[PDB]
Amino acid sequence: DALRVGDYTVAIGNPFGLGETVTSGIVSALGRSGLNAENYENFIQTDAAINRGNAGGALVNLNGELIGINTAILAPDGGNIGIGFAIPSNMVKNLTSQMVEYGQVKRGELGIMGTELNSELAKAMKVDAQRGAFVSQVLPNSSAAKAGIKAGDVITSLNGKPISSFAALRAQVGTMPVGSKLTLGLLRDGKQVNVNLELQQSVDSSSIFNGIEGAEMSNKGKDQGVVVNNVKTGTPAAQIGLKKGDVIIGANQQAVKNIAELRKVLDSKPSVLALNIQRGDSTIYLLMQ
């Protein structure tokens, strides 16, 4: 968070399995996002040369302190053309800190929504800043709303440090533990109200699909069964006719009344597995693999 667009960077890695090669460059630009829209991107851009195999390599400042892990380039021919992308060490230190204590990442949740504030919105919304995060939707009963987060604000500060983009602020926050506490500077009507905050929880079911993912299944009541609130058509779980409002016991003579009881025996890797789902009064079956 101290890096500036101008500092000198020295990259390390193993391109083309040649071995440990060093490169010099500078921080080309900060807070780069969007080259892959889904994942959390707050990339440091460096003109330090980086090619295939440099990934996971260190990007360090002139004292040798880790400022980034190089993750991507931009290469129409697959060879460095002056653009390297690195994930900042402060996002890295956070996830290395979650994988040690927990073994996985405690996906944090704030309770807002938004979209990148362009220079057009600040013209009509009479907002002073041109780059920020426009809180369209404030989710209710969320730790975010608990702080008095207004609808129609723009977050511009995070720990007194300005913010490049939403997808950067979005990325800057998604790399944090479920019980951290951070400050946000705002801009409601002309008053820069800074408010403290905390994140609150968020059990994915695409890991139970394993290639046949079609829709979202959870847990029902007092483990009466899995859940089928999902209603998807044309998905990998659609030709097999999983419609709404139908879970049962389970497959291959297995008593399945919750998500965990299903996972106990599904992962015994059976050759063919046949559910027992029942719609209304009709007890049916349904086979996979």
Binding site: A37, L110, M113, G114, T115, E116, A133, F166, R170, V173
Partner: peptide, 5 residues
């Protein structure tokens, strides 16, 4: 697009 945070 729509963005969640």
């Amino acid at each position: 697009c729509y963005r969640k945070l």
